Design a binder for this molecule. Structure first.
Ligand code: 088
Lengths: 11, 230
């Protein structure tokens, strides 16, 4: 649901 | 009017990330090198769109006052502004006639990519129109940030904490529309018109994704995410 975007915002 | 020392950094802090990251030559080079088929065209456009969602998260990453907002709010924002930022980024290319854009060929692949006609017309019109404004990189970068940080978005939570971030940028755009464009007052109001037009394309787009989806057209995991389930 937001796994990929949340990841990208925590890099 | 000019620009307070506090707003003098908003222009730089923003105009920095805007140049800090561009698209890989290996990708934008395919617009020219690769063949011109309805699949190869659609495939290349998917590639750019996907690679661009990253630059977006990165650019939108910084944006002062951004990492302060609720995590269930940064997502809504990135999702609701994905396509609009992308649309505004391509407009810059066709208008700036950038060398790495290959707009002449790009416009080719675009027109022949399974895209409906109803949506192919408005698309270029917006391009010719917005093009006529002879916008400046500073106008593009600020307008984009303005687009990304739009309270009015859907599934938002603290719509009030967003307006506290967009309003500042909006104030720095007008000042420029009075400083670098005194001869015409409406400039600022010209640029804000682009916010409602971009929004019109979100509507066109949700639909052109359906046409694609029914045709066994898949998108990357990342784009599927941002555009919701593909
Ligand atoms: C999924 C794919 C088929 C797609 O669906 N709708 C759109 C679509 C269309 Cl056809 C028009 C407008 C918006 C979208 Cl989403 C797209 C991808 O189309 C584009 C076209 C141009 C784009 C992009 C992304 C970037 N650019 C330009 C660019 C070139 C070089 C460097 C940079 C940079 O990042 O500085 C940008 C995507």
């Amino acid at each position: 649901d937001h796994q990929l975007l949340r990841y990208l915002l925590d890099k | 009017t000019e620009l307070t020392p506090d707003q003098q950094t908003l222009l730089h802090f923003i105009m920095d990330s805007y140049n800090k990251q561009r698209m890989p030559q290996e990708i934008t080079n395919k617009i020219l090198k690769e063949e011109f088929s309805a699949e190869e065209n659609f495939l290349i456009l998917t590639e750019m769109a996907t690679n661009h969602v990253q630059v977006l998260v990165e650019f939108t990453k910084k944006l002062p006052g951004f990492q302060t907002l609720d995590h269930e709010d940064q997502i809504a924002l990135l999702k609701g502004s994905a396509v609009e930022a992308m649309f505004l980024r391509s407009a810059e290319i066709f208008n700036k006639k950038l060398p790495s854009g290959h707009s002449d060929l790009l416009e080719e692949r675009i027109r022949n990519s399974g895209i409906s006609d109803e949506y192919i017309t408005p698309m270029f019109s917006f391009y010719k129109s917005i093009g006529e404004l002879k916008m400046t990189q500073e106008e593009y970068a600020l307008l984009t940030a303005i687009v990304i940080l739009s309270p009015d978005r859907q599934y938002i939570k603290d719509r009030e904490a967003v307006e506290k971030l967009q309003e500042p940028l909006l104030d720095v755009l007008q000042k420029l529309c009075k400083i670098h464009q005194p001869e015409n007052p409406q400039h600022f109001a010209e640029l804000l018109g682009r916010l409602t037009e971009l929004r019109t394309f979100n509507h066109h787009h949700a639909e052109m994704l359906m046409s694609w989806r029914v045709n066994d057209h898949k998108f990357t995991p990342l784009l599927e995410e941002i555009w919701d389930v593909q």
